[PDB]
Design a protein around this nucleic acid. Structure first.
Ligand SMILES: [Mg+2]
Ligand SMILES: [Mg+2]
Ligand SMILES: [Mg+2]
Ligand SMILES: [Mg+2]
Ligand SMILES: [Mg+2]
Ligand SMILES: [Mg+2]
Ligand SMILES: [Mg+2]
Ligand SMILES: [Mg+2]
Ligand SMILES: [Mg+2]
Ligand SMILES: [Mg+2]
Ligand SMILES: [Mg+2]
Ligand SMILES: [Mg+2]
Ligand SMILES: [Mg+2]
Ligand SMILES: [Mg+2]
Ligand SMILES: [Mg+2]
Ligand SMILES: [Mg+2]
Ligand SMILES: [Mg+2]
Ligand SMILES: [Mg+2]
Ligand SMILES: [Mg+2]
Ligand SMILES: [Mg+2]
Ligand SMILES: [Mg+2]
Ligand SMILES: [Mg+2]
Ligand SMILES: [Mg+2]
Ligand SMILES: [Mg+2]
Ligand SMILES: [Mg+2]
Ligand SMILES: [Mg+2]
Ligand SMILES: [Mg+2]
Ligand SMILES: [Mg+2]
Ligand SMILES: [Mg+2]
Ligand SMILES: [Mg+2]
Ligand SMILES: [Mg+2]
Ligand SMILES: [Mg+2]
Ligand SMILES: [Mg+2]
Ligand SMILES: [Mg+2]
Ligand SMILES: [Mg+2]
Ligand SMILES: [Mg+2]
Ligand SMILES: [Mg+2]
Ligand SMILES: [Mg+2]
Ligand SMILES: [Mg+2]
Ligand SMILES: [Mg+2]
Ligand SMILES: [Mg+2]
Ligand SMILES: [Mg+2]
Ligand SMILES: [Mg+2]
Ligand SMILES: [Mg+2]
Ligand SMILES: [Mg+2]
Ligand SMILES: [Mg+2]
Ligand SMILES: [Mg+2]
Ligand SMILES: [Mg+2]
Ligand SMILES: [Mg+2]
Ligand SMILES: [Mg+2]
Ligand SMILES: [Mg+2]
Ligand SMILES: [Mg+2]
Ligand SMILES: [Mg+2]
Ligand SMILES: [Mg+2]
Ligand SMILES: [Mg+2]
Ligand SMILES: [Mg+2]
Ligand SMILES: [Mg+2]
Ligand SMILES: [Mg+2]
Ligand SMILES: [Mg+2]
Ligand SMILES: [Mg+2]
Ligand SMILES: [Mg+2]
Ligand SMILES: [Mg+2]
Ligand SMILES: [Mg+2]
Ligand SMILES: [Mg+2]
Ligand SMILES: [Mg+2]
Ligand SMILES: [Mg+2]
Ligand SMILES: [Mg+2]
Ligand SMILES: [Mg+2]
Ligand SMILES: [Mg+2]
Ligand SMILES: [Mg+2]
Ligand SMILES: [Mg+2]
Ligand SMILES: [Mg+2]
Ligand SMILES: [Mg+2]
Ligand SMILES: [Mg+2]
Ligand SMILES: [Mg+2]
Ligand SMILES: [Mg+2]
Ligand SMILES: [Mg+2]
Ligand SMILES: [Mg+2]
Ligand SMILES: [Mg+2]
Ligand SMILES: [Mg+2]
Ligand SMILES: [Mg+2]
Ligand SMILES: [Mg+2]
Ligand SMILES: [Mg+2]
Ligand SMILES: [Mg+2]
Ligand SMILES: [Mg+2]
Ligand SMILES: [Mg+2]
Ligand SMILES: [Mg+2]
Ligand SMILES: [Mg+2]
Ligand SMILES: [Mg+2]
Ligand SMILES: [Mg+2]
Ligand SMILES: [Mg+2]
Ligand SMILES: [Mg+2]
Ligand SMILES: [Mg+2]
Ligand SMILES: [Mg+2]
Ligand SMILES: [Mg+2]
Ligand SMILES: [Mg+2]
Ligand SMILES: [Mg+2]
Ligand SMILES: [Mg+2]
Ligand SMILES: [Mg+2]
Ligand SMILES: [Mg+2]
Ligand SMILES: [Mg+2]
Ligand SMILES: [Mg+2]
Ligand SMILES: [Mg+2]
Ligand SMILES: [Mg+2]
Ligand SMILES: [Mg+2]
Ligand SMILES: [Mg+2]
Ligand SMILES: [Mg+2]
Ligand SMILES: [Mg+2]
Ligand SMILES: [Mg+2]
Ligand SMILES: [Mg+2]
Ligand SMILES: [Mg+2]
Ligand SMILES: [Mg+2]
Ligand SMILES: [Mg+2]
Ligand SMILES: [Mg+2]
Ligand SMILES: [Mg+2]
Ligand SMILES: [Mg+2]
Ligand SMILES: [Mg+2]
Ligand SMILES: [Mg+2]
Ligand SMILES: [Mg+2]
Ligand SMILES: [Mg+2]
Ligand SMILES: [Mg+2]
Ligand SMILES: [Mg+2]
Ligand SMILES: [Mg+2]
Ligand SMILES: [Mg+2]
Ligand SMILES: [Mg+2]
Ligand SMILES: [Mg+2]
Ligand SMILES: [Mg+2]
Ligand SMILES: [Mg+2]
Ligand SMILES: [Mg+2]
Ligand SMILES: [Mg+2]
Ligand SMILES: [Mg+2]
Ligand SMILES: [Mg+2]
Ligand SMILES: [Mg+2]
Ligand SMILES: [Mg+2]
Ligand SMILES: [Mg+2]
Ligand SMILES: [Mg+2]
Ligand SMILES: [Mg+2]
Ligand SMILES: [Mg+2]
Ligand SMILES: [Mg+2]
Ligand SMILES: [Mg+2]
Ligand SMILES: [Mg+2]
Ligand SMILES: [Mg+2]
Ligand SMILES: [Mg+2]
Ligand SMILES: [Mg+2]
Ligand SMILES: [Mg+2]
Ligand SMILES: [Mg+2]
Ligand SMILES: [Mg+2]
Ligand SMILES: [Mg+2]
Ligand SMILES: [Mg+2]
Ligand SMILES: [Mg+2]
Ligand SMILES: [Mg+2]
Ligand SMILES: [Mg+2]
Ligand SMILES: [Mg+2]
Ligand SMILES: [Mg+2]
Ligand SMILES: [Mg+2]
Ligand SMILES: [Mg+2]
Ligand SMILES: [Mg+2]
Ligand SMILES: [Mg+2]
Ligand SMILES: [Mg+2]
Ligand SMILES: [Mg+2]
Ligand SMILES: [Mg+2]
Ligand SMILES: [Mg+2]
Ligand SMILES: [Mg+2]
Ligand SMILES: [Mg+2]
Ligand SMILES: [Mg+2]
Ligand SMILES: [Mg+2]
Ligand SMILES: [Mg+2]
Ligand SMILES: [Mg+2]
Ligand SMILES: [Mg+2]
Ligand SMILES: [Mg+2]
Ligand SMILES: [Mg+2]
Ligand SMILES: [Mg+2]
Ligand SMILES: [Mg+2]
Ligand SMILES: [Mg+2]
Ligand SMILES: [Mg+2]
Ligand SMILES: [Mg+2]
Ligand SMILES: [Mg+2]
Ligand SMILES: [Mg+2]
Ligand SMILES: [Mg+2]
Ligand SMILES: [Mg+2]
Ligand SMILES: [Mg+2]
Ligand SMILES: [Mg+2]
Ligand SMILES: [Mg+2]
Ligand SMILES: [Mg+2]
Ligand SMILES: [Zn+2]
Lengths: 204, 131, 118, 122, 59
RNA sequence: UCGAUGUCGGCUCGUCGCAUCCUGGGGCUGAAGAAGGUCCCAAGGGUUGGGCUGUUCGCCCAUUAAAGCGGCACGCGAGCUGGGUUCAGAACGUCGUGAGACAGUUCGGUCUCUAUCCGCCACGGGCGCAGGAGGCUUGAGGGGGGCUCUUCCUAGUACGAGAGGACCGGAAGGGACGCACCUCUGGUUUCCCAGCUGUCCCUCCAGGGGCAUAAGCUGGGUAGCCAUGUGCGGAAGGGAUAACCGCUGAAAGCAUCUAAGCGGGAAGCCCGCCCCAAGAUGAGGCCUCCCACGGCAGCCGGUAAGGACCCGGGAAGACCACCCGGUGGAUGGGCCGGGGGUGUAAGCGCCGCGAGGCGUUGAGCCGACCGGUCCCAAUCGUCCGAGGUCU
RNA sequence: CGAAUGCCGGCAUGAGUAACGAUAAAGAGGGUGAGAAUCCCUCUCGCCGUAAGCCCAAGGGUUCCUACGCAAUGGUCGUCA
RNA sequence: CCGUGAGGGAAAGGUGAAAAGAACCCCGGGAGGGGAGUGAAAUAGAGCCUGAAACCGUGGGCUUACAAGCAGUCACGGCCC
């Protein structure tokens, strides 16, 4: 279940066989294994990867310490790749060949406290024929006296975006080892320069 | 890091430097590759470039022609591998970036608004005289 | 949703804000130091510094630009003659914004001062 | 992007001139019909003594939209008119000719003859 | 709208409880290195017009 | 319930029932095949757009896998509407000597900014999880999602006189819905550029500013936020089952799917997939860090590891919270190069009586986008914060 | 007296909540003063101009001027009225 | 004060025997208070006899952050007097 931590640079498109392929580029490598989870010691299999070197002045003792036991230089970010055990001390996009498939994770853009026509695609009310201050309102949230209550999981206006989103089965279009760049066809969540995980796909 | 460069680096392998320079108001002929049955032919298409949207690699220019009684516009990725070539055929002197108004003008009225661009013409003829 | 937008609104429409920055430029390029609000200042740095920096080029054209926002000529003449010169070797930053500890009584507005740089 | 109410110019020698789309024949609830797709529409303005006539309910494929249509090569295409060619339930054009260009997508989707009778394919 | 209005008076406890967040967080003060008079960080000392070690104001 | 429980239809938003309209799995069939009919299992998902009418309903047009019926005060007016109806006006038909009446028809007719409590959508503060901290995690348990059509191959084969035309298996392309993204297509883009009219002004010309909207009009318009645009998803697979189909098999020498026992078998139940989540007080686990401080399971005081306040800010955001940075520094603002937009500035010179045109010139101006540079400001600091109870 | 949507008065809740009366608009400097976004002066910006400017008449009745004041009225503040 | 008018129609008492009604000093612009002083008494200080209740606040003792409820009653237990 290979995977790699990385940041989102941006997305353009390229040409491949007289065809335009939208791509999003990711600065995946290079991630050093700073710890290996185990079933006996921790009770489960994974690999804690590091990504983005960090200025030691901003790194504190317990962190500095943990980076020691792994003989690992400091770093900015720490995420795990469950059920994954690389044979070596360092992970790189080389683990991905072109034409493969991956599931991508990113902290989606944040739309703030967004409305109901925006978070839940409602249709609100008409813009005429007598609409009285409801042009973007939801409607009715319940029945009457039975049940005489509102449902849980109900759809209402609220914070929307800036939440973890995992996109799946994307296409490895190309990998640029020279720079640790993974090209994946499709849309990847989150803003540019945001963090993303690139885990092997679970689809078939 | 720099996000721009990397992006520019991925594009760097698909950028063209053989296509000629041109402007809205110019008349252009774009030898374009086309697939059909079952081979591939090069279909020319000649019209006033009414719109060069720019973004380095993502620059795309809009060419407009009037084909048999119907007005057709079409979009071309300036760095597409389909374009065999591009021949200039006239330097029009549009006094504007986008020519959205010649969609409603007559073939005549369009001629008054885009009388030739003498300058970018001799300038052309200025070259072309290699050794 | 305000993703990647620079330049506040200061509760003022398209022009009252333009007149504000200007009317703060005039009243700054005149006295060296005024005492406004922390925000009004912050957004007045960039507006001015562009003005002076054109004063540094001093060419005919610039004067006519800067003079749109400032109108007054004597002031502008004070800009290209006196101020602008003491800034030629300086690369940007012609203004300094500092905040005052004591807070306005009427509305507790946070005070800060904007001054021309040495 | 053709939907009900959308008048369409006609590019053949049926006698009809303009038709109001009333249904896209492309699924249970498709929203719009584009180049190469088939629709059912009314005859809202034809010529005298022609094959069709103001009122008939007919089938016809859309050949030319005013909304550009994208392509796998990045390119696009947009015509100044929305046009269709009246056809029969076997996709054959009930006309003997066609007028103006047509979109190279039509061939893809089984309308060989029209593509042949069209003066310029794009 | 139909003029919403409370069905019951709010108990003392129920209001005084809702006010467990009305505590004023006292102002952040620090000493001025040249007059030692307390004042907020990041402001031009109102007691001696000093800031960044240099003079800036009359007081 | 008349010191008021507002009553039809629609819009919006759902959710449940299953006597199932569709998709799925079966038995019988006057089931050859394809396509139908009739009962049984199944409520996961779906169940279009229109014309008439206030209408529910019904009829009709075009479609479809199908265009299901019903409950939630004939769901839903402190959520909207207000066509019907059901105050006062007016009129028609009818009844009444009349005043007036009928619900029969007809045109018109005030629908009330502020949510205390439960409830719901999101977000914090406090505390607690026996030492105190900084990070990374298990996932009990919840939520989300679950749809379907078409065409080619099998094959014009099995079947059938013929028209028509399969099961099983294998590919390809769509529709509606959903999550996210902004390369392309397409919108906005409040002062990024330019053009233009009338008026007042600076400075007479020239060049400019104000106002004409809360941009004066117009033509263009980066970033950002967007969809019509783009990528992706429904699954595969494993397990247990429903209606049905059996293996072996007594009772009951035959027979029987069951009484002992073992199989096959649904879009449905369980897991798998996406998201949340240890307040999971059953408060879990792992890595690193700190320590065994003074005075008298408690108190007071000073530190450690750490954090908080303060500040510069951010596609994070109502405040708060979260994320980055604070001179050991590229966080914001300015300056510089690039991108980008507008599309050839002012000034001078030449042609023209003149409005103008030409060259200097893709020139000048120039917000947000990708980077560099300590010029400007995040100066200087303060306050909390362990001594780890008992068997 | 414990109730009459009772009568007079006092004090609570909703609550530090809506709102603070036209979206024509504000910015800096100097002075004053115990105290200033709110008063005076100065410059810049905006706003009415068949008026939001100038007269007369009804009506109001000392609100006009000046000096000294800010508890109360001013929907904030007030050294202003 | 309400109403054009006939007409309607309030609320509002108390220091002390005697002002002997708080000079003077102190913080403050003032209001207000802190000592001094008067008085038998000053939470009789003029916003004054007595000063209840709602209502508001400060300090203290017990108690509360896995609980559920007409809030109370019975039993027990822990802490405080
Ligand atoms: Mg990237
Ligand atoms: Mg992440
Ligand atoms: Mg946001
Ligand atoms: Mg959404
Ligand atoms: Mg929407
Ligand atoms: Mg709608
Ligand atoms: Mg409507
Ligand atoms: Mg709408
Ligand atoms: Mg209304
Ligand atoms: Mg409205
Ligand atoms: Mg609603
Ligand atoms: Mg209701
Ligand atoms: Mg109930
Ligand atoms: Mg959030
Ligand atoms: Mg490639
Ligand atoms: Mg980029
Ligand atoms: Mg590089
Ligand atoms: Mg032409
Ligand atoms: Mg080629
Ligand atoms: Mg907005
Ligand atoms: Mg920014
Ligand atoms: Mg901003
Ligand atoms: Mg601005
Ligand atoms: Mg701001
Ligand atoms: Mg304005
Ligand atoms: Mg304006
Ligand atoms: Mg700038
Ligand atoms: Mg402050
Ligand atoms: Mg035609
Ligand atoms: Mg007819
Ligand atoms: Mg051809
Ligand atoms: Mg209402
Ligand atoms: Mg209303
Ligand atoms: Mg109530
Ligand atoms: Mg109480
Ligand atoms: Mg209390
Ligand atoms: Mg409360
Ligand atoms: Mg002093
Ligand atoms: Mg009742
Ligand atoms: Mg009743
Ligand atoms: Mg009621
Ligand atoms: Mg009642
Ligand atoms: Mg049944
Ligand atoms: Mg079925
Ligand atoms: Mg079936
Ligand atoms: Mg039969
Ligand atoms: Mg048969
Ligand atoms: Mg059959
Ligand atoms: Mg059957
Ligand atoms: Mg169902
Ligand atoms: Mg259903
Ligand atoms: Mg219908
Ligand atoms: Mg209609
Ligand atoms: Mg009916
Ligand atoms: Mg009938
Ligand atoms: Mg059919
Ligand atoms: Mg069927
Ligand atoms: Mg009923
Ligand atoms: Mg009924
Ligand atoms: Mg009802
Ligand atoms: Mg209702
Ligand atoms: Mg209503
Ligand atoms: Mg209703
Ligand atoms: Mg009505
Ligand atoms: Mg009616
Ligand atoms: Mg009726
Ligand atoms: Mg009625
Ligand atoms: Mg009547
Ligand atoms: Mg009559
Ligand atoms: Mg009659
Ligand atoms: Mg009658
Ligand atoms: Mg009678
Ligand atoms: Mg009668
Ligand atoms: Mg009657
Ligand atoms: Mg009647
Ligand atoms: Mg009317
Ligand atoms: Mg009526
Ligand atoms: Mg209304
Ligand atoms: Mg009311
Ligand atoms: Mg509430
Ligand atoms: Mg309740
Ligand atoms: Mg919490
Ligand atoms: Mg907390
Ligand atoms: Mg952290
Ligand atoms: Mg565990
Ligand atoms: Mg639970
Ligand atoms: Mg679970
Ligand atoms: Mg065959
Ligand atoms: Mg045979
Ligand atoms: Mg199949
Ligand atoms: Mg599909
Ligand atoms: Mg972009
Ligand atoms: Mg775009
Ligand atoms: Mg675009
Ligand atoms: Mg400007
Ligand atoms: Mg003058
Ligand atoms: Mg003049
Ligand atoms: Mg002029
Ligand atoms: Mg003016
Ligand atoms: Mg004006
Ligand atoms: Mg307005
Ligand atoms: Mg303007
Ligand atoms: Mg446009
Ligand atoms: Mg843009
Ligand atoms: Mg769409
Ligand atoms: Mg799909
Ligand atoms: Mg048998
Ligand atoms: Mg047997
Ligand atoms: Mg058995
Ligand atoms: Mg089995
Ligand atoms: Mg079994
Ligand atoms: Mg079997
Ligand atoms: Mg099984
Ligand atoms: Mg399926
Ligand atoms: Mg998580
Ligand atoms: Mg925990
Ligand atoms: Mg439990
Ligand atoms: Mg723990
Ligand atoms: Mg902020
Ligand atoms: Mg920090
Ligand atoms: Mg520091
Ligand atoms: Mg920086
Ligand atoms: Mg910078
Ligand atoms: Mg720049
Ligand atoms: Mg550039
Ligand atoms: Mg450019
Ligand atoms: Mg020129
Ligand atoms: Mg020039
Ligand atoms: Mg001359
Ligand atoms: Mg010439
Ligand atoms: Mg530039
Ligand atoms: Mg450096
Ligand atoms: Mg520095
Ligand atoms: Mg100790
Ligand atoms: Mg009684
Ligand atoms: Mg009442
Ligand atoms: Mg009452
Ligand atoms: Mg009541
Ligand atoms: Mg009373
Ligand atoms: Mg508040
Ligand atoms: Mg509230
Ligand atoms: Mg509120
Ligand atoms: Mg408010
Ligand atoms: Mg205006
Ligand atoms: Mg304002
Ligand atoms: Mg001032
Ligand atoms: Mg002053
Ligand atoms: Mg003031
Ligand atoms: Mg004051
Ligand atoms: Mg004001
Ligand atoms: Mg006039
Ligand atoms: Mg008089
Ligand atoms: Mg009066
Ligand atoms: Mg007077
Ligand atoms: Mg006063
Ligand atoms: Mg006062
Ligand atoms: Mg006052
Ligand atoms: Mg007052
Ligand atoms: Mg006042
Ligand atoms: Mg008032
Ligand atoms: Mg005074
Ligand atoms: Mg005075
Ligand atoms: Mg009266
Ligand atoms: Mg009177
Ligand atoms: Mg009376
Ligand atoms: Mg009296
Ligand atoms: Mg007495
Ligand atoms: Mg005194
Ligand atoms: Mg004093
Ligand atoms: Mg004093
Ligand atoms: Mg006194
Ligand atoms: Mg006293
Ligand atoms: Mg005494
Ligand atoms: Mg005695
Ligand atoms: Mg006594
Ligand atoms: Mg007493
Ligand atoms: Mg007493
Ligand atoms: Mg007495
Ligand atoms: Mg008393
Ligand atoms: Mg008292
Ligand atoms: Mg207490
Ligand atoms: Mg429990
Ligand atoms: Mg407890
Ligand atoms: Mg007991
Ligand atoms: Zn100081």
């Amino acid at each position: 279940m290979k995977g790699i931590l990385g940041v989102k640079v941006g997305m353009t498109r390229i040409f491949r066989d007289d065809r335009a392929v939208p791509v999003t580029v990711i600065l995946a490598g290079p991630c050093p294994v700073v710890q290996r989870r185990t079933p006996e010691k921790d009770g489960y299999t994974a690999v804690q990867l590091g990504f983005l070197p960090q200025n030691p002045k901003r790194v504190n003792r317990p962190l500095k310490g943990h980076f020691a036991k792994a003989g690992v230089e400091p770093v900015r970010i720490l995420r795990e790749i469950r059920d994954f055990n690389p044979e070596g001390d360092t992970v790189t996009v080389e683990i991905f060949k072109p034409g493969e498939r991956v599931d991508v994770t990113g902290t989606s853009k944040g739309r703030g406290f967004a409305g109901v026509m925006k978070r839940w695609n409602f249709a609100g009310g008409p813009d005429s024929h007598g609409a009285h201050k409801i042009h973007r309102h939801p409607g009715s949230i319940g029945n009457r006296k039975t049940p005489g209550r509102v449902y849980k999981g109900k759809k209402m206006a609220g914070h929307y975006g800036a939440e973890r989103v995992t996109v799946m089965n994307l296409e490895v279009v190309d990998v640029i080892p020279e720079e640790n760049l993974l090209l994946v066809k499709g849309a990847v969540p989150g803003p540019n320069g945001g963090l993303v995980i690139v885990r092997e796909t679970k689809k078939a | 890091m720099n996000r721009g460069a990397l992006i520019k680096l991925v594009e760097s392998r698909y950028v063209r430097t053989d296509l000629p320079e041109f402007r809205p108001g110019d008349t252009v002929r774009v030898s374009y590759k086309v697939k059909e049955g079952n081979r591939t032919r090069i279909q020319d298409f000649e019209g006033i470039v009414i719109r060069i949207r720019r973004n380095g690699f993502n620059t795309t220019f809009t060419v407009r022609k009037v084909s048999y009684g119907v007005g057709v516009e079409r979009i071309f990725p300036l760095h597409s591998p389909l374009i065999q070539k591009i021949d200039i055929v006239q330097r029009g002197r549009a006094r504007r970036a986008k020519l959205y108004f010649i969609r409603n003008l007559s073939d005549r009225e369009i001629r008054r608004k885009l009388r030739a661009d003498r300058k970018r013409i001799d300038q052309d003829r200025a070259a072309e005289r290699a050794a | 949703m305000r993703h990647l937008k620079s330049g506040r609104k200061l509760n003022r429409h398209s022009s009252h804000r333009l007149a504000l920055y200007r009317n703060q430029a005039k009243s700054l390029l005149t006295h060296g130091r005024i005492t406004t609000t922390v925000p009004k200042a912050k957004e007045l740095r960039g507006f001015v510094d562009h003005l002076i920096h054109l004063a540094k080029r001093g060419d005919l054209h610039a004067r006519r630009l800067v003079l749109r926002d400032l109108q007054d000529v004597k002031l502008v003449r004070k800009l290209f003659d006196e101020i602008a010169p003491r800034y030629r070797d300086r690369q940007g930053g012609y203004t300094r914004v500092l905040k005052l500890a004591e807070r306005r009584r009427g509305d507790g507005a946070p005070l800060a001062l904007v001054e021309l740089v040495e | 992007m053709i939907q009900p109410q959308t008048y369409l110019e006609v590019a053949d020698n049926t006698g009809a001139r303009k038709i109001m789309c009333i249904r896209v024949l492309k699924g249970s609830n498709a929203k719009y019909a584009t180049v190469g797709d088939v629709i059912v529409a009314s005859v809202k303005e034809a010529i005298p003594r022609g094959a069709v006539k103001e009122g008939d309910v007919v089938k016809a494929v859309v050949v030319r939209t005013k909304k550009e249509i994208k392509r796998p090569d990045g390119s696009a295409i947009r015509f100044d008119d929305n046009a269709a060619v009246i056809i029969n339930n076997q996709l054959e054009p009930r006309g003997t000719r066609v007028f103006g260009p047509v979109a190279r997508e039509l061939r893809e989707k089984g309308f060989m003859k029209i593509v042949s009778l069209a003066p310029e394919v794009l | 709208a139909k003029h919403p209005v409370p069905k019951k008076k709010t108990s003392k406890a129920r209001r005084d409880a809702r006010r467990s967040h009305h505590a004023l967080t006292p102002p952040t003060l620090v000493p001025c290195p040249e007059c030692k008079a307390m004042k907020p960080p990041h402001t031009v000392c109102p007691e001696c017009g000093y800031y960044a070690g240099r003079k800036v104001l009359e007081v």
